[PDB]
Paper text:
The atypical cadherins Fat and Dachsous are key regulators of cell growth and animal development. In contrast to classical cadherins, which form homophilic interactions to segregate cells, Fat and Dachsous cadherins form heterophilic interactions to induce cell polarity within tissues. Here, we determine the co-crystal structure of the human homologs Fat4 and Dachsous1 (Dchs1) to establish the molecular basis for Fat-Dachsous interactions.
The binding domains of Fat4 and Dchs1 form an extended interface along extracellular cadherin (EC) domains 1-4 of each protein. The Fat4 EC1–EC4 domains are positioned opposite the Dchs1 EC4, EC3, EC2, and EC1 domains, respectively. There were direct contacts between Fat4(EC1):Dchs1(EC4), Fat4(EC2):Dchs1(EC3), and Fat4(EC4):Dchs1(EC1), but no substantial contacts were observed between Fat4(EC3) and Dchs1(EC2). The Fat4(EC1):Dchs1(EC4) interface was oriented similarly to the Fat4(EC4):Dchs1(EC1) interface with one notable difference. Within Dchs1(EC4), the Arg387 residue central to the Fat4-binding interface is highly conserved across all species sampled. Thus, the EC4 domain of Fat4 is indispensable for binding to Dchs1 while the EC4 of Dchs1 makes a minor contribution to the interaction. The alignment of EC2–EC3 of each protein revealed that the EC1 of Dchs1 is tilted by ~35° towards Fat4, making it the only protomer that adopts such a pronounced curvature in a protocadherin-like binding interface.
Numbering used by the authors:
A (entry chain B): 43 to 467
B (entry chain A): 42 to 462
Write the structure that this text describes.
Amino acid sequence: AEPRQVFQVLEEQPPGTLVGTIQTRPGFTYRLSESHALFAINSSTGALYTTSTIDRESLPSDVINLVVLSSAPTYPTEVRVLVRDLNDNAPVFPDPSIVVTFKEDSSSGRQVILDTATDSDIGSNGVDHRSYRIIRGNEAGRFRLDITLNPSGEGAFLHLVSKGGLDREVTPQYQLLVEVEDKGEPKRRGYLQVNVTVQDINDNPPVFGSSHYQAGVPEDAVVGSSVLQVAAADADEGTNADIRYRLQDEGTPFQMDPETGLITVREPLDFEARRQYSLTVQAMDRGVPSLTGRAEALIQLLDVNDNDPVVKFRYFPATSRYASVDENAQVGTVVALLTVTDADSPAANGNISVQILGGNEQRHFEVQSSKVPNLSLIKVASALDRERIPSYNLTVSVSDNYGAPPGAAVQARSSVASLVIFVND
Amino acid sequence: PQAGSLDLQIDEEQPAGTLIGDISAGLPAGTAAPLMYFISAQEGSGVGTDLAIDEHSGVVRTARVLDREQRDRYRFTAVTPDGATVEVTVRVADINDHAPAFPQARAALQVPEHTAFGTRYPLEPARDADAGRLGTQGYALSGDGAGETFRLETRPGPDGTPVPELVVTGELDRENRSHYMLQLEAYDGGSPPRRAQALLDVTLLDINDHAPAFNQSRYHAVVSESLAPGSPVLQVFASDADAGVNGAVTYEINRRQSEGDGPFSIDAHTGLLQLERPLDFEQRRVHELVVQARDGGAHPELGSAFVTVHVRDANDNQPSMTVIFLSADGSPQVSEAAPPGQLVARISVSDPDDGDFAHVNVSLEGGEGHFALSTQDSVIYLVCVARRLDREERDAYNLRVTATDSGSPPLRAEAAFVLHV
Ligand SMILES: *[C@@H]1O[C@H](CO)[C@@H](O[C@@H]2O[C@H](CO)[C@@H](O)[C@H](O)[C@H]2NC(C)=O)[C@H](O)[C@H]1NC(C)=O
Ligand SMILES: *[C@@H]1O[C@H](CO)[C@@H](O)[C@H](O)[C@H]1NC(C)=O
Ligand SMILES: *[C@@H]1O[C@H](CO)[C@@H](O)[C@H](O)[C@H]1NC(C)=O
Ligand SMILES: *[C@@H]1O[C@H](CO)[C@@H](O)[C@H](O)[C@H]1NC(C)=O
Ligand SMILES: *[C@@H]1O[C@H](CO)[C@@H](O)[C@H](O)[C@H]1NC(C)=O
Ligand SMILES: [Ca+2]
Ligand SMILES: [Ca+2]
Ligand SMILES: [Ca+2]
Ligand SMILES: [Ca+2]
Ligand SMILES: [Ca+2]
Ligand SMILES: [Ca+2]
Ligand SMILES: [Ca+2]
Ligand SMILES: [Ca+2]
Ligand SMILES: [Ca+2]
Ligand SMILES: [Ca+2]
Ligand SMILES: [Ca+2]
Ligand SMILES: [Ca+2]
Ligand SMILES: [Ca+2]
Ligand SMILES: [Ca+2]
Ligand SMILES: [Ca+2]
Ligand SMILES: [Ca+2]
Ligand SMILES: [Ca+2]
Ligand SMILES: [Ca+2]
């Protein structure tokens, strides 16, 4: 009253495979109990045979209980069939290729948790979680594999430890492949790809294209014109590459466009105010911790003839309206001085001419360019009469950029003044 | 000769009328003594109100207090009535009148930590008013920590005044040394050196240095089945030594690599792991988790730790059973008074098991004594016939099987049938 047997059979076998022979009784016919499409029993004192190929992984449970039948009293002996594996499935990762991001310039020890492969087969025929290897991509020798196994039978974790030295500017991406092997009679393999995309950190500062910039500007430049153009570059990517230019000392009459780097004339210039400006330009990146690069910028102003010359006289008396000269003034004595004043530089004002107009351009008394460049002497080159000519109204001229070649852009600008002379003895 | 040249000099901010010189010394030696010195100076670029000249004698004196800050040297030509010329030049000598001075008495500087050695930070220099050797000169750093971490290298800026540049040296980490209180001093030329001082509060910025590190690498628990959902499991701990948002640790739970994280959830800012639905050992044996923590802010660093929650079972799952009748067509029946010592059905017991595998005792209700119960291997049961089933004024018998679980609490399972002739 206690007969019970157990049979064992392999999977993925052609139909009709002999499982086992149930013990027989003389004169009895046995058949199945409930109809299922996996087995059928030979009643002629036979055995148990499969009727179809079956994949063990496709079953809800391995062991399957079956009940026999009998002729008259229908005595039932129970039968259990165990189906195994043979390792027909290979290890497979949940996703073939994923992307992980690493922090560049980070010390050794930075890691990331990766996916662990799984195999549909049984325990022994399952994935060997201690056999993970990285077979390609790591030819540079940057990373390593660290596997953390769990005290619970169901669980495993894999790490991707970086040995430091990661630099985006040298190599921003690594494509790695992992080879995992099924721990089976047939060692079947699985693969996973890792797109390692390192992230950019602001480690490089902006650098200018030149160390010293030189440019010449005419002082007649209108407000808004261009002075010079600076250019910088940053080896980083994205936000750490956006450069903002600025003039280190924006108190000058210039202005820096914070994006193009074009120094413009913000206020009207003048050469006689200042000759040249020794500026310094900055270059600031938009990184999380900002950096700055510098370079000197020299701007030379170019003079133009925008100031006219004047002539002021000093004659025989000081606090007097009109000059006075004695009649017996011996020939060769100085009367007044021709002081020619010009504020502009000679580089933009040329040679200065002085001629006689409306007076005595008639050897009545000569004018002489003294040994001093601008100063001239007013003497008495002759003895004269008092009643005939008791007074004079001598005026002179003075021209900027005079004696210029034809078609010259340095046009002349002049101004005339007068000084009178009286004979009072 | 017929001309001459003469140079002069005078000190600064000396009272008016102070002697400058005499034009007589500039005339050629042996020339006649002139009766009047005609003065010719550059108009508007000139003597104007800043010199007094006696025409009949040639002596020169200062018209007002003299400042060379506006005008350093004067030049003018004196002419005699005879025609001789004396090119005169007067220089104003410098004296230390304006001491150096800083625009900020206590300036503040902000420098990121872990900065590269030798990167330079310019500062506001002490402007020199008295130009030449008397202004300008050199800075000396008197703050503490200047011998190892912060040195000063001078650089000449615009118009030649020296601009101090604080260079970076040594260690810089706000996790240890937060800020420095430096002091700057500026001197100048001249036998009595004028000085100016100012303090500098150098503070170190913070950067994402440290990733959230956990209290222990892996945690443990042994919660039972059917635990209260609102009850806690365990609390994790993580630290981050940075400041600001970089010190804020937000605890989360990885959903990918964790196997069994369904019934669980973690509090965001306390690390308290709490379940949301009850778990079953007769469904899930153990839960393996991976928790994380984010270094809050721009581009967060990531820490991680493991959680292992074992489960021990309780007898809460009712016993199961299946019945198949062994007489001809599976449908329940019996013959007109069947022979004795005959069986009409088969019963097999099963249950979600911890402790005693299976081993359940069945309680077949009576059957009025014409039926019996037998067991094969304490797991499969049978149904026998007794008393020949005489059919004494009886057609069918309603029968029922009761599965009695062999656990600490009583767990029953009903299963009724009808057996006819
Ligand atoms: C004569 O001297 C006078 C100054 O007293 C000069 O100034 C001119 O004077 C005349 C007097 O009739 C005026 O009509 C003019 O308007 C004044 N200015 C100018 C620019 O001419 C005068 O120029 C002298 N004479 C000449 C011929 O130059
Ligand atoms: C059972 O096996 C025997 C083996 O000789 C065979 O003769 C018989 O035909 C088989 N049963 C059936 C129904 O074919
Ligand atoms: C990883 O790189 C491969 C290269 O071809 C690409 O096909 C794949 O889509 C990448 N992974 C993801 C998640 O995009
Ligand atoms: C931290 O700074 C102090 C100075 O305040 C120094 O003595 C110490 O060595 C520093 N820490 C380390 C680990 O060097
Ligand atoms: C860190 O973990 C241990 C492990 O149980 C615990 O005893 C300790 O209280 C934890 N630290 C804090 C600050 O709670
Ligand atoms: Ca299979
Ligand atoms: Ca298999
Ligand atoms: Ca396998
Ligand atoms: Ca880098
Ligand atoms: Ca970078
Ligand atoms: Ca950058
Ligand atoms: Ca001008
Ligand atoms: Ca000009
Ligand atoms: Ca001119
Ligand atoms: Ca002064
Ligand atoms: Ca001075
Ligand atoms: Ca000084
Ligand atoms: Ca930090
Ligand atoms: Ca941090
Ligand atoms: Ca999951
Ligand atoms: Ca359950
Ligand atoms: Ca339970
Ligand atoms: Ca139970």
